[PDB]
Structure formats: C-alpha cells, structure tokens
C-alpha cells in the first residue's frame, strides 16, 4: 500500500490564474529500471477519468500544454499555467511502480469567490410523516462559501448525533456557492417527548452560530 | 481509436455473485495489460485487478480488498476481459471501469458499468412537505423524499431551486429539494413539488401549505 497523499484536497482558483497540486508517495516511485511510474488524471463530473501526464512529465496526446508535471522520488507537482473552465474537476495522481497500484484521494479544483454566510431555515415534521410514526426535522443551509461548515442539532439544549443525515450540492454554476441539507430523523416517540429543536450552523464568515429553532408545542 | 465497453452490471444481493465483461475494439493484437478500476458513489478511484499480456504469462494481480473474492481473466481470440466477483458486500457497490494499460497508463476507459450490491426491493418514496411556521422578504420551502429504491427520483417545482444528492439511510435512499420564492408569492400562489419515482410508477404532487 504505497500511500498517495495529495495537497490540497480542495483548491479554489480564479480562472486565468496558475494552479499547483502536490502529490507525495509514502515511498520512492523510482523503479530499478530508472523509470518513475507516477501519473495524473482529471475527472470531470459524471465522466471517466482522462489521462493528462504519465511518467512524471510526459503529456498524453491531446492534452494542452498548459498542463505540466514534475518532481522526483516521492515528491510530485502538477501545474496548470492559466486555469480554464474546462479544467475544473477532480485531479488524481496515480502510481504504478508498485503493486497494488494506488491513487491519491483527489484534489477538487473549484471556483474562488468571496466568503458568504448560509441562509438557514428549519422545518418541523409534517403531519403526513407524523401520521406514519416518524418525525424528521430538516434544516436547509443555502448559498454559502466556502463549502466547509459545522451543523449541530440540539434537542432541549442537549446535542444530538444519532439520526442525522447531511447532503451537500456541488458548486453552483452561476454564483459559485454551495448549499447543504441536514436532516435529523427521530421516532414520533422521541419527538413527542421533547419540545425545543435547534439547528446551529457555524461557518468561517462569523464566530457566532446561525441558530434556527422551533418549539413543537407551538406548531 | 481504441474503444472500451464494459457490461454485466446490475442489482445483486449481498453474498451474491456477478460476472462483468469488457470488450476492446480498434486495438492492435492483445499485447497490453487490462485493468479494472472502481469508484464508489462520491469517493475516489480504487484499482481492483490487473491482467497482463500473453508475453507476460497473463499474470494477474488484485487489490487486497477484493483478493480471493474476485478473479480476472481474458479471452484474446475475442479481445474480451472478464471480472468474476463472488461473495459481494454492500461496500462493493461502485461504478466499475475496464481500463487499458498499454504504452500509456490507464489511458482508455469505458463509460463504466454500475454494480449495486443491496438487499432492498423497488420501493416508492414518502413525499413530505417542508413548510415554515411555528418571515422576511423571501421564503424557503422544500420537499423531503424519504425511503425509496432504486435510485433516481426527479423533483419538479410548480430557478431558485436546490436538489440535494440522495444518500443511504437504512438501506433506502433519502433526498430533499428546496425552493426560494418571494414572500409576496407564497402562500398566495400555489407552490407544489412533484416527485416522480419511475421504477415504482409514482408521481406525487405535493401542495405546500402553511
């Protein structure tokens, strides 16, 4: 298991700027035969990966000269000289010097914009769901940047971990923001046993959480 | 141009077996290695198996995670590659790609074949309205689409819409969709989410009310 470590895992870029991605191996990728079998792939959403660079610095046929690879031993860099919209996607480094063949985790090249705090809203369980014996509480956290965000659920002041499901959109094509849905699923039994339901979102835009809540008995 | 096409994917029960096939077209002889690489939903690339050319004694190699559950082979008289998977686990759920390794590493990929390893049966979703109130100039509404199988619903609103990727929750899928309208427009104008789950033959049209 030659571990392939890519840095950073998320890379915000302004179009037209240079970008560099680091890939480091847990051991040397230099083979006895003098070759270094280290390669780079780009994967665009809903597509098979495309080869960019093989054996450190060789560009594959059809790949624009704005992509270049370098490095040696355990230390490798892909550079894109002037990023284009076409270049956005997930970059993977690959080693094939050692079996098992391994891949880096992927570096997602995304659009840099101004930080934006989420618009947050909370929704109680529907009467429909409650009739059926379940009770999902939902929080939408919409149009924020960057994508990193901490959502905390609280019931009657105490934090809750179980029954929470979080889903993020991909970066918006128009405004370059992200959105996320957080759903706490309880039993109707737990729901009818507690009264105060809160979703708290902390994001780098502010040191204070965005707090949204309701009281069951008021609905 | 060399073309690669995988096939044989589908729905299989845990502990079950599945053979995937691959054909390479527009190629010169069979003097190259072939690989299978997989990708679990929302995850990275995982190399799975490698079979070398005749010249390299058709040598085979496997990822530790699949070794001795998977077997790879090749029939060069038809330029076919095979992946036999046994004792499948829910974690083997992935898109499976057949990939060439000739002069260039992992150069030519198929579009992939989808393998879902699951015990679930084809199930309609419950469609739940998400309405505020227990305001401001804009109001956000939503629909929660819970406990369906297999994947792929479509929510349509009757664009300030967000569609949140489906995730697994107790062996079934759950997704949600939000819409933001000026507060002047709802609840004065009807707002409805229409949720279609083609596999179960369902369309739910859910009017959102305060």
């Amino acid at each position: 298991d030659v571990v392939m470590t890519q840095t950073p895992l998320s890379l915000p870029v302004s179009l037209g700027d240079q970008a560099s991605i680091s890939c480091r191996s847990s051991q040397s990728l230099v083979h006895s035969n003098g070759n270094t079998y280290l390669h780079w792939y780009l994967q665009k959403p809903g597509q098979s990966p495309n080869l960019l660079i093989y054996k450190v610095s060789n560009r594959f046929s059809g790949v624009p000269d704005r992509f270049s690879g370098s490095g040696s031993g355990t230390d490798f860099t892909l550079k894109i000289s002037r990023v284009e919209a076409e270049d956005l996607g997930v970059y993977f480094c690959s080693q094939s010097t050692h079996v098992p063949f391994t891949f880096g985790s992927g570096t997602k090249l995304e659009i840099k914009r101004a930080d934006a705090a989420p618009t947050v809203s909370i929704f109680p369980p529907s009467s429909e769901q409650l009739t059926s014996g379940g009770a999902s509480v939902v929080c939408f956290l919409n149009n924020f940047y960057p994508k990193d965000i901490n959502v905390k659920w609280k019931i009657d002041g105490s934090e809750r971990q179980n029954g929470v499901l979080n889903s993020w959109t991909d970066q918006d094509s128009k405004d370059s923001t992200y959105s996320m849905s957080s759903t706490l699923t309880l039993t109707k039994d737990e729901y009818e046993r507690h009264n105060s339901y809160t979703c708290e979102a902390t994001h780098k835009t502010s040191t204070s959480p965005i707090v949204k809540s309701f009281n069951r008995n008021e609905c | 141009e060399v073309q690669v096409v995988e096939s044989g994917g589908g729905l299989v029960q845990p502990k079950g077996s599945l053979k995937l096939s691959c054909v390479v077209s527009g190629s010169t002889l069979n003097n190259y290695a072939m690989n299978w690489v997989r990708q679990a939903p929302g995850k990275g690339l995982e190399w799975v198996a490698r079979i070398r050319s005749k010249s390299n004694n058709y040598a085979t190699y496997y990822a530790d995670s699949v070794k001795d559950r998977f077997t790879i082979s090749r029939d060069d008289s038809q330029s076919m590659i095979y992946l036999q998977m046994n004792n499948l686990k829910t974690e083997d759920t992935a898109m499976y790609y057949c990939v060439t390794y000739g002069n260039h590493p992992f150069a030519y990929w198929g579009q992939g074949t989808l393998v879902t390893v699951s015990a679930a049966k084809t199930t309609p979703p419950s469609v739940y309205p998400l309405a505020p109130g227990c305001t401001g100039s804009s109001v956000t509404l939503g629909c929660l689409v819970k406990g369906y199988f297999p994947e792929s619903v479509t929510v349509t609103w009757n664009s300030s819409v967000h569609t949140f990727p489906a995730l697994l929750q107790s062996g079934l899928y759950t997704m949600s969709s939000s819409v933001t309208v000026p507060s002047s427009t709802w609840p004065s104008q009807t707002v409805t989410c229409s949720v279609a789950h083609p596999a179960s033959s369902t369309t739910v049209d859910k009017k959102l009310e305060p």
Partner: peptide, 9 residues
C-alpha cells in the same frame, strides 16, 4: 494502440 504495457517484467 494501445501498444505494449509500459511496465517492467
């Protein structure tokens, strides 16, 4: 191609 596998014996 794809050509000969460009990896050692």
């Amino acid at each position: 191609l794809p050509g000969e596998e460009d990896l050692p014996g």
